[PDB]
């Protein structure tokens, strides 16, 4: 038989991954009649072939391929070559050539200038000798049926949909650049040709990790989806009867909001919380039953905060639109009871994004009512391996730069009420900007931004650049702030990324008591912060938080039993002798021994920084001086560590004058 799969698949490593249970098939019985196909080169062939054709006709070709039926290519060199190839070693010549041309090309003589050979070579054709000969430009619909007919199809063109390109001759003559079958097989790029074929549906098409496979499935579901065969994981299970980091399995929940507010169940609305990782679900123990998410003080029970915090947000099932809940207990709506009613998809994604490619500081901008205090308290309570991955000690509050003004910059924006003569009071300003429905006037808020931007640029960017350079002098950290162009004009080195909560934030501004200034002052200023921001991607904070939390669960699964004396590791800057053996702890890695014994001998001693040593004690119990260091070279790539191990992202280094030495590896 045959069945599709919505990922890249190999004959080699896909058996190690176990893709069927990864997509959720109960195939725990070792039926072992599913020969995994190698469908990795087809993507490379595809992206090579997008440069000379439309996507559409190449997909329309590629759908007809009987992947069960076996075929192969043989590349042919051009016409002005093949005679010179058959000249040397005339043994391998097919009998389809010509009697006259074989008599011409059998003998030894160089035959460079003779009108017989010139009229024969001009008379030579490449397609009468070899019958398929797909072509230079072949309208590639037909080549799929050509590969379906024969076990071998001949070409002169590099670009092909198909199994394997093979060379007819040695490489020096060229231009620039069988299988075992079980009863079942999986493999992406399905076929409609087979009478018996199936397509593994169930997965969302919006959530496919690869994009070539995503485009292919969009086309195949947009044309002749009638004749396809979409089957569930249960149908697949009934037909049946070096471990990686940053590829977590991830699912999607199906809850809704109800109440018991009058002694009765009552369903109001239905929700979808996308791409929540299954490891957190199975480690928190979430089942179908009725839950209560906000405890009676007024604050969340915080496991649900964690549950929506590691994931992204909410789609309403009746409108398919965005939805961001109220975090207050006000009676427009709240959420007291939920009941998760199932899971829908079981795909796996990469966790590490594209941009984070070097070890350097990380900045994140948030809206003003983001849950900064509670997320700092949650990262404060992280203990997985006897190590805190995100301590409180090197996380940066949004107003750490904002509180160190000797005018205390909030007291410089408390000054703004005298810009307009009719205002001349802070509470009159807060009454005056809003339309008395807590939606602001456009014009009053616009004039306030006209006054607000010179205070927002003239001092904030220089002194915030000073603060960010001072923080750069002491470790790489996680710097939160608001209104991203603060991080942009102050020349903040480091990966900044623009995230948001899956909640609404303004009612969080309105409920927070004992905050400086008026209760409306906070809301107005929050509007001004989102004015000063750009128009970028809000990018859904879970993309960072899954990187923060999710891999160390797998490292907990893998090194639950080995000793620290073989699993711990440390890397950092080194100094050779004592004045007034020496080391700077840069990054901490915990990995299995079968990774550390190869990470031993890698050229760590390559890079250079300018280290600074002073004399004061740390409040911590070992001897540690708050050292300083500035790198005078490049930055360390994250490829060099592994994809098989995980590291602490941000850290503060510790244990005179400037020394300017290099690093090495610290063994274990």
């Amino acid at each position: 038989a045959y069945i599709a799969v919505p990922a890249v698949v190999d004959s080699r490593s896909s058996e190690a991954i176990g893709l069927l249970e990864s997509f959720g098939v109960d195939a725990g019985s070792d039926a072992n009649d599913v020969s995994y196909q190698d469908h990795d080169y087809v993507v490379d062939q595809l992206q090579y072939m997008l440069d000379g054709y439309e996507a559409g006709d190449v997909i329309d070709a590629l759908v007809y391929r009987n992947w069960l039926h076996h075929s192969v290519y043989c590349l042919l060199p051009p016409k002005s070559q093949l005679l010179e190839y058959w000249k040397s070693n005339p043994s391998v010549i097919p009998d389809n050539v010509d009697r006259r041309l074989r008599k011409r090309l059998m003998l030894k003589k160089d035959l460079r200038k003779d009108d017989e050979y010139n009229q024969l070579a001009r008379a030579f054709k490449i397609s009468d000798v070899y019958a398929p000969l797909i072509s230079s430009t072949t309208s590639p619909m037909t080549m799929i049926q050509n590969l379906n007919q024969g076990e071998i199809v001949y070409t002169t063109t590099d670009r092909v949909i198909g199994a394997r390109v093979l060379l007819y001759a040695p490489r020096k003559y060229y231009a620039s650049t069988r299988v075992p079958h079980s009863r079942f097989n999986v493999g992406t790029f399905p076929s409609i040709a087979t009478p018996k074929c199936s397509v593994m549906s169930g997965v969302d098409i919006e959530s496919i990790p690869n994009e070539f496979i995503k485009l292919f499935y969009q086309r195949v579901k947009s044309i002749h989806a009638n004749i396809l065969n979409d089957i569930s994981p249960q149908i697949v299970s009934d037909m049946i009867n070096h471990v990686d980091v940053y590829r977590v399995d991830v699912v999607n929940v199906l809850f809704e909001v109800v109440d018991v507010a009058d002694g009765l169940r009552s369903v109001s609305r239905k929700l979808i919380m996308h791409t929540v990782p299954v490891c957190i679900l199975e480690l928190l123990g979430i089942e179908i039953a009725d839950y209560c998410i906000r405890q009676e003080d007024g604050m969340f029970t915080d496991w649900f905060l964690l549950l929506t915090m590691l994931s992204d947000g909410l789609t309403d099932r009746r409108t398919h639109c965005q939805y961001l809940i109220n975090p207050s207990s006000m009676p427009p709506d709240v959420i007291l009871n939920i009941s998760i009613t199932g899971f829908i998809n079981r795909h796996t994604i990469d966790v590490m994004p594209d941009v984070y490619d070097f070890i350097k500081p990380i900045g994140a901008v948030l809206p003003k009512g983001s849950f900064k205090s509670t997320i700092m308290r949650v990262l404060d309570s992280i203990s997985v391996l006897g190590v805190k991955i995100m301590p409180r000690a090197h996380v940066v509050d949004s107003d750490e730069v904002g509180e160190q003004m000797e005018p205390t910059f909030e007291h410089a924006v408390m000054e703004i009420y005298k810009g307009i003569a009719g205002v001349d009071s802070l509470d009159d300003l807060t009454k005056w900007v809003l339309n008395s429905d807590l939606v602001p006037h456009d014009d009053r808020l616009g004039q306030l931004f006209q006054a607000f931007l010179p205070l927002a640029k003239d001092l904030l960017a220089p002194m915030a650049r000073q603060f960010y350079d001072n923080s750069m002098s002491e470790g790489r950290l996680l710097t939160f702030a608001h209104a991203d162009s603060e991080l942009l004009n102050a020349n903040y080195f480091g990966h900044l990324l623009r995230l948001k909560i899956p909640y609404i934030t303004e009612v969080n501004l309105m409920i927070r008591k004992n905050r400086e200034g008026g209760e409306l002052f906070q809301l107005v200023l929050s509007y001004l912060y989102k004015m000063y921001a750009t128009s970028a991607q809000p990018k859904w904070f879970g993309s960072l938080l899954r990187l923060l939390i999710c891999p160390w669960l797998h490292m907990e699964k893998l090194i639950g039993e080995a000793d620290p004396a073989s699993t711990s590791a440390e890397i950092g800057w080194h100094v050779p002798r004592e004045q007034l053996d020496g080391f700077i702890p840069y990054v901490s890695i915990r990995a299995p021994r079968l990774v550390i014994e190869e990470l031993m001998e890698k050229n760590w001693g390559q890079y250079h920084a300018q280290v600074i040593v002073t004399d004061q004690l740390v409040v911590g119990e070992p001897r540690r001086v708050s050292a300083k260091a500035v790198i005078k070279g490049n930055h360390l790539p994250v490829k060099l560590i592994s994809r098989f191990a995980c590291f602490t992202l941000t850290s503060k280094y510790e244990m005179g004058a400037a020394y300017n030495a290099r690093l090495a590896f610290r063994s274990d």
Partner: protein, 1060 residues
């Protein structure tokens, strides 16, 4: 400040869910080039039903009067009905369904102990503050959308697996159908209700033992082939006759669509015109389903909507022409012969003493450049769509100064234009060719003209319209040969020789509807002439039209350089070389004119059905100015009051049509230089080229989008006709539910509610019935027309075929009219009044001693004048009648609900005290309402006053909550009665939703009693009734014969091979 918090969060929920805010035309380009096909074939392994029986309160299993050895529940008998005290039936689309592909369209309805108001505040209650409110004027629109959702969910086809004979003697060895899933243990018990044993004297057993034995499971099969799937079976299983009829209508629609591979072979063969052969088998078939055939009218509707979509842009049609240029490049057998223009014109003879060289002048003034051919194939491709695009030549290819006849380069520019201009599709190309030369010579003569504005020095491109054609061009005799004999000559050249129109006959009538509008079926129209070549090996002759025209132009120019009495200003070597260059340029070789005259319309006709954008032509005219199309118009609606679109169409049109402005040099160089292959054979070359083009399926896949387009627009018009007053004859069934006085915003928003429901169904993600939403959705109609120059207007108003979806919506409306109880609605209204008794009667069916009407004597009726005067010094507070009388607070009154809503707070304080204790009763006329049920054990005291007062307080001018009731629980042994106090009573019988009372018990002694409804299970209880019988308009019957199928849906590629 908390009030401001609440209203600001409501202003956050003031966001619109559906709003086309972005600009659309590049989505329209993508939509026009390619579209999403709908998901028709969708299957069902589970049993088709839409209702289910739910228990409400659990039956008393421990009691003293009956030992527990009597009940089947102590023996754990898998019984079909819930052995509870009170069982009601509720509504669930597909609770027994191993589906193939969900519609995401399920209708959930919770049992009436709890609430269902979110379904009724679904659409237009975006302004209800509380979570439990609903505007009664939105009730009809919400119920219409819910019925639409109900029928739009279960649009599947019944699929069958797994027949096996039991070994229990419960039946007569009847074959039982299996079904997939995790288990099948409860499923046979719930599926075949008469299978079970008959031990007790319970109501369940007393029902079941009075049934018929043989009507279980399989009784018919259609076996075509030995050792294969039985093709369609007939089973006796539990179901829902409503959804059985809906699936039957959908099955009939698909069976109407179905076709035969022999005639697919026929259709594709004659569509390829014999250049590609295909092969269909000749053997017994298993069974197939190819849904591809539709009617002609649906093709016409889809084409009108599509041409109405691409209006006045040209950037939506430029990539279509580009695609056809690439396709004609791929198929067409001509290329550049790169060296004609220099090999010929190498042998031109002149001295090197002459300053100006005509050879090098045109030989560097035109550039072949290989990119001209894409423009040429576009200019060839515009002939399919003369109606919507009109290719012309821009100003920049013109001599841009008026030129000069004495100027050699301007003369050559005129030559380029005189070759190029006959190929385009504008109707004014003859006067372009005329007034170009009249611009070329100004000053040798003048001609009599129209006015002082469009004089002879007016720009050539200015005319471009029928009326700007001069009378001098109309009549030859106005140009005397003493004035300009060369101009009279040029005018005759045009009138005598200019091309003639023709036709080629593409098409496929049996399978495809002829998508043209203004032409006869299966025809094309050409600007030029076509005679088909008999030979296979082609060669060159000078005996066709383009060649003749080219030659004629050269001759005029030989005459023009001959006229030395006007043109002596050359030193005679340039005269001789001019005449030689003319004659040799006349006799250059080029296969391009015979290509256009023989092969290109043949290829074009072979291509023409394989298009996402089907051809759409407006008839050509050579020179008859009274048959020139001034416009073409589409429409969307009737205008003011008039129903007839033949009356509405004239003043309510929408003009469509763009220019294109191609280049003349590109066209002319492609005319001048064009070769065949040196060894070409036309049938071998076409069997090579055209063969992979017919490996497509999208050319069939667009037909189903045309299906669902026509179905959606007919469902739209018959659904808007229920909410407002329109011009289409419908039979409304939803009168008694109150509804808003609608308006434009109301009908418009409801139209996009049904649009997004339809797009969520059927897997459609791009732009269904959206151009109709730009207009007014009330008075919609579809037509198209065009007009010649003399006021001659021709139109096409195609009929709208009936919709299976709309038919099933009306059927569901009819069934809702009787089973209004099953969706949680009661008819009539309520009565509020202090009732003190020990009786056990249900408030869903009050005794008629209590209710009253307008006709009841001594009952007051309050309309618009409701003033309320206080009673000073101990007088009774009173209210003014509608009839003008004053009445104290006593007796039986009748209110409309809107009065209470508008004055809810003032009336609560004035009226709640008397209704609690004193003698006062109120009728509140509302027609429809959702309800909730609160049971009670009748052995104890009970008062509903908190629930009633909660309703009377929560009620609101813009919303109402669900109406709470209080009804006791039926018993088995006799109990001791206790007094209970009821206030909210109904006025009409509403007990057509409770299934059975005390089902596991042998009898019910108190409370409401109800047997198993025998009138539902007709087939099991009437021996005289045939198996195929429905009383579907009145009741539901919940158990019938249902058919299932086991068709296969292979690809048309895997049916029809065509292997060479």
């Amino acid at each position: 400040i908390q009030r401001h918090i609440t209203e600001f969060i409501s202003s956050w929920q003031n966001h619109p869910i559906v709003q086309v805010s972005a600009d659309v035309e590049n989505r329209k380009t993508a939509q026009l080039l390619h579209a999403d096909t709908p998901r028709l074939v969708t299957w069902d392994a589970g049993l088709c039903t839409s209702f289910k029986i739910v228990p409400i309160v659990p039956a008393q299993v421990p009691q003293d009067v009956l030992a527990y050895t009597f009940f089947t529940s102590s023996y754990a008998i898998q019984s079909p009905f819930p052995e509870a005290a009170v069982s009601r039936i509720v509504v669930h689309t597909r609770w027994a369904s191993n589906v193939d592909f969900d519609r995401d369209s399920s209708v959930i309805m919770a049992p009436p102990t709890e609430n269902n108001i979110h379904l009724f505040k679904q659409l237009l209650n975006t302004e209800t503050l509380s979570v439990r409110g609903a505007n009664p004027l939105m009730f009809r629109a919400n119920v219409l959308h819910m019925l639409l959702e109900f029928v739009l969910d279960n649009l599947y086809l019944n699929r069958h697996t797994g027949f096996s004979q039991d070994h229990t003697p419960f039946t007569e060895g009847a074959n039982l159908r299996s079904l997939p899933g995790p288990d099948a243990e409860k499923w046979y018990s719930i599926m075949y209700p008469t299978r079970m044993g008959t031990p007790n004297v319970s109501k369940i057993c007393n029902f079941v033992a009075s049934c018929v034995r043989n009507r279980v499971g399989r009784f018919d099969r259609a076996q075509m082939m030995n050792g294969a799937m039985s093709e369609w079976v007939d089973v006796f299983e539990t179901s829902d006759a409503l959804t059985v009829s809906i699936r039957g209508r959908w099955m009939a629609r698909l069976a109407r669509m179905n076709i035969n591979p022999t005639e697919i072979e026929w259709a594709l063969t004659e569509c390829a015109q014999g250049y590609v052969t295909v092969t269909s088998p000749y053997a017994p078939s298993v069974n197939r389903l190819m849904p591809y055939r539709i009617s002609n009218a649906e093709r016409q509707i889809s084409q009108i909507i599509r041409v109405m979509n691409i209006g006045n842009n040209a950037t939506v049609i430029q990539p279509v022409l580009q695609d056809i240029s690439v396709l004609l490049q791929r198929i067409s057998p001509l290329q550049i012969d790169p060296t004609i223009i220099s090999n010929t014109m190498s042998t031109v003879s002149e001295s090197t003493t002459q300053t100006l060289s005509p050879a090098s002048s045109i030989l560097g003034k035109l550039r072949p450049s290989n990119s001209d051919f894409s423009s040429f194939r576009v200019a060839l491709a515009g002939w399919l769509y003369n109606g919507v695009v009109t290719t012309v030549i821009d100003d920049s290819s013109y001599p841009k100064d008026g030129g000069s006849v004495t100027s050699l380069e301007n003369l050559w520019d005129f030559f380029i234009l005189a070759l190029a201009l006959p190929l385009t599709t504008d109707p004014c190309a003859p006067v372009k060719a005329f007034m170009t030369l009249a611009n070329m010579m100004v000053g040798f003569e003048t001609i009599p003209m129209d006015n002082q504005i469009y004089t002879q020095s007016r720009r050539a491109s200015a005319f471009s319209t029928p009326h700007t054609w001069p009378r001098c061009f109309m009549n030859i005799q106005l140009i005397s040969p003493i004035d300009a004999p060369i101009l009279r000559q040029w005018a005759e050249i045009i009138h005598r020789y200019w091309p003639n129109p023709s036709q080629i006959r593409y098409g496929t009538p049996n399978v495809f509807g002829s998508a043209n509008l203004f032409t006869p079926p299966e025809v094309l129209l050409l600007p030029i002439d076509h005679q088909p070549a008999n030979v296979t090996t082609p060669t060159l002759d000078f005996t066709n039209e383009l060649t003749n025209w080219r030659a004629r132009v050269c001759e005029l120019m030989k005459n023009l350089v001959d006229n030395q009495r006007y043109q002596p200003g050359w030193t005679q070597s340039l005269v001789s070389s001019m005449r030689g260059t003319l004659g040799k340029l006349k006799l250059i070789k080029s296969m391009t004119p015979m290509y256009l005259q023989q092969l290109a319309p043949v290829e074009l006709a072979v291509i023409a059905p394989m298009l996402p954008f089907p051809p759409f032509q407006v008839p050509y005219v050579r020179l008859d100015r009274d048959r020139v199309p001034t416009m073409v118009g589409v429409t969307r609606q009737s205008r003011d009051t008039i129903t007839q679109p033949a009356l509405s169409l004239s003043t309510t049109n929408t003009t469509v049509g763009v220019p294109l402005a191609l280049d003349a040099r590109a066209i002319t160089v492609a005319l001048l230089s064009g070769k065949y292959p040196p060894d070409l054979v036309t049938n071998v070359w076409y069997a090579d080229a055209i063969y992979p083009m017919y490996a497509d399926t999208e050319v069939f896949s667009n037909l189903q989008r045309d299906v669902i387009t026509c179905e959606a627009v007919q469902t739209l018009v018959t659904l808007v006709a229920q909410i407002s007053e329109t011009q289409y004859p419908v039979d409304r069934y939803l009168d008694w539910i109150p509804s808003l006085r609608a308006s434009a915003a109301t009908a418009a928003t409801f139209a996009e509610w049904v649009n997004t429901s339809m797009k969520t169904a059927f897997d459609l993600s791009d732009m269904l019935l959206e151009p109709l939403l730009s207009g007014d959705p009330r008075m919609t109609q579809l037509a198209i027309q065009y007009q010649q120059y003399n006021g001659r207007t021709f139109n096409v108003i195609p009929e709208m075929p009936g919709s299976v979806i709309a038919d099933c919506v009306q059927l569901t409306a009819e069934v809702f009219n009787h089973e209004y109880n099953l969706f949680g609605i009661a008819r009539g209204d309520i009565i509020i009044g202090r009732v003190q008794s020990t009786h056990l009667w249900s408030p869903l069916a009050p005794p008629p001693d209590l209710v009253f009407d307008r006709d009841t004597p001594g009952v007051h009726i309050f309309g618009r004048d409701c003033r309320i005067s206080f009673g000073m010094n101990g007088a009774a507070p009173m209210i003014r009648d509608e009839t003008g009388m004053m009445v104290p607070f006593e007796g039986n009154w009748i209110f409309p609900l809107a009065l209470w809503q508008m004055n809810t707070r003032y009336f609560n304080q004035q009226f709640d005290a008397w209704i609690k204790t004193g003698e006062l009763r109120i009728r509140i006329e509302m027609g429809a309402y959702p309800y909730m049920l609160h049971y009670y054990d009748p052995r104890q005291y009970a008062n509903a006053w908190n629930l009633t007062s909660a309703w009377l307080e929560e009620i609101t001018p813009t919303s109402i909550p669900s109406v709470p009731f209080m009804v006791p629980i039926s018993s088995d042994h006799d109990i001791s009665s206790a007094p209970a106090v009821q206030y909210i009573i109904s006025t009409e019988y509403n007990d057509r939703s409770l299934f059975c009372t005390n089902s596991s018990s042998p009898q019910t002694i108190a409370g409401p009693d109800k047997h198993i409804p025998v009138e539902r299970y007709n087939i099991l209880t009437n021996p005289d009734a045939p198996p195929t019988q429905i009383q579907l308009p009145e009741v539901v019957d919940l158990y019938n014969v249902v058919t299932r199928y086991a068709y296969e849906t292979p690809p048309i590629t895997a049916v029809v091979m065509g292997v060479p």
